[PDB]
């Protein structure tokens, strides 16, 4: 279930975000800076770590098993041992390939959208001043400075309506 943002309307992306996975790039009269939303990238890193808790470390302590490396042929029981070992390896290799496929697909799918929160946050003060922007850069007509982008980052944004431009 792709959401069509990271391959969609986020077409290039800027390469400098070393502190976080996501960010809030902007352009102001006092300088076009950057951001990093710690909540969203923290959620993403937490779910990656939760994925790797079942994977990285805490394996199954399988101590004694059957002999898999073989030699000159002995009987049908050696053929059965080779067959059960090969079917276990094929099942586990199919299962690991499937697990990689589902978790890579799910990682791409969840690390995608969740930018509707910014949309609905910006709506009620963006609905009046030159109406609604959603094309990937929020062309926010709230004439403001880095304090308003700080409030958008902080998720503490009020709605000071800009009635100077109602239609154009």
């Amino acid at each position: 279930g792709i959401f069509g943002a990271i391959a969609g309307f986020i077409e290039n992306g800027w390469e400098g975000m070393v502190d976080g996975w996501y960010g809030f790039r902007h352009q102001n009269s006092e300088g076009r800076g950057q951001a990093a939303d710690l909540k969203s990238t923290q959620a993403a890193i937490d779910q990656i770590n939760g994925k790797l808790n079942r994977l990285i470390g805490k394996t199954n302590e399988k101590f004694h098993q059957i002999e898999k490396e073989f030699s000159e042929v002995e009987g049908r029981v050696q053929d059965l041992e080779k067959y059960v070992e090969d079917t276990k390896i094929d099942l586990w290799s199919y299962n690991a390939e499937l697990l990689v496929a589902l978790e890579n697909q799910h990682t791409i799918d969840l690390t995608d959208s969740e930018m509707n929160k910014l949309f609905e946050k910006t709506k009620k003060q963006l609905r009046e001043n030159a109406e609604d922007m959603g094309n990937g850069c929020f062309k926010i007509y709230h004439k403001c400075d880095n304090a308003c982008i700080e409030s958008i980052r902080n998720e503490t944004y009020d709605h000071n309506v800009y009635r100077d431009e109602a239609l154009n």
């Epitope: 800027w14 400098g16 300088g31 950057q34 880095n146």
Partner: antibody, heavy 120, light 107 residues
Framework: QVQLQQSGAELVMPGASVKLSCKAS????????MHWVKQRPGQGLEWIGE????????NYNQKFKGKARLTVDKSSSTAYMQLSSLTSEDSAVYYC?????????????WGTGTTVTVSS | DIQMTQTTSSLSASLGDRVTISCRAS??????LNWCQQKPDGTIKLLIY???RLHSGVPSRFSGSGSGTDYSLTISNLEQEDIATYFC?????????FGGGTKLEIK
């Protein structure tokens, strides 16, 4: 290795023009910004301007309008400094510095500097 | 323009001593400060970015903190390679402004 290789020293007439260079390497040029820092000997560090390697956004210091200009060449990964109307007060060491995007502006990688001297 | 000042012109400390260096901004510059180390040969290096976190590769003995207008940089245990001049930088409003500088010497 991220190193901003820089040119040598120059010596020109007062009132002449010079063009500096700073070759970026080891990293993608359009990612991080370029900033240049002037240090007169015995004086403090001064910030003169910033550029955006992706689309050439220009922001300059207030005291240096019409005097310092910023250009880049995205093909060669190079940041250029053209100076105009030079005076004896202009003699300094110009440091080419990398820069994190926008107004955050922490210069994660610095350069070596060019000894610019103005005399007759 | 933010007239940004380093009050301590110079300071001396011995090897292994805990030296604390500080600087003050004329206004509230939030939490964006940059500490620059200039060795006497000419190599500049940035130390503390965003007034709390340190650049990777810098030894862990360097530490800078502060909030509001007053900020400080603390070196827990000095060594021989730490002899340099230190500049502190604000970055909130254009243009960026560096500190007055302070040349640390060995007593």
């Amino acid at each position: 290795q991220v190193q901003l290789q820089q040119s040598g020293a120059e010596l020109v007439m007062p009132g002449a023009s010079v063009k500096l260079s700073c070759k970026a390497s080891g990293y993608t040029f359009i990612s991080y910004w370029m900033h240049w820092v002037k240090q007169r000997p015995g004086q403090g560090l001064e910030w003169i301007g910033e550029i955006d390697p992706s689309d050439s956004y220009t922001n300059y210091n207030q005291k240096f309008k019409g005097k310092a200009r910023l250009t880049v060449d995205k093909s060669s990964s190079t940041a250029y400094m053209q100076l105009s109307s030079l005076t004896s007060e202009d003699s300094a060491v110009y440091y080419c510095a990398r820069g994190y995007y926008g107004s955050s502006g922490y210069f994660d990688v610095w350069g070596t500097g060019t000894t610019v001297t103005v005399s007759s | 323009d933010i007239q940004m000042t380093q009050t301590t012109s110079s300071l001396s400390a011995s090897l292994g001593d805990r030296v604390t260096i500080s600087c003050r901004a004329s206004q509230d510059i939030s939490n964006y400060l940059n500490w620059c180390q200039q060795k006497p040969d000419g190599t500049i290096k940035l130390l503390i970015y965003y007034t709390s976190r340190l650049h990777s590769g810098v030894p862990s003995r360097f530490s800078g903190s502060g909030s509001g207008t007053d900020y400080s940089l603390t070196i827990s245990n000095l060594e021989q390679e730490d002899i340099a001049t230190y500049f502190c930088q604000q970055s909130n409003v254009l243009p960026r402004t560096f500190g007055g500088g302070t040349k640390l010497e060995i007593k």
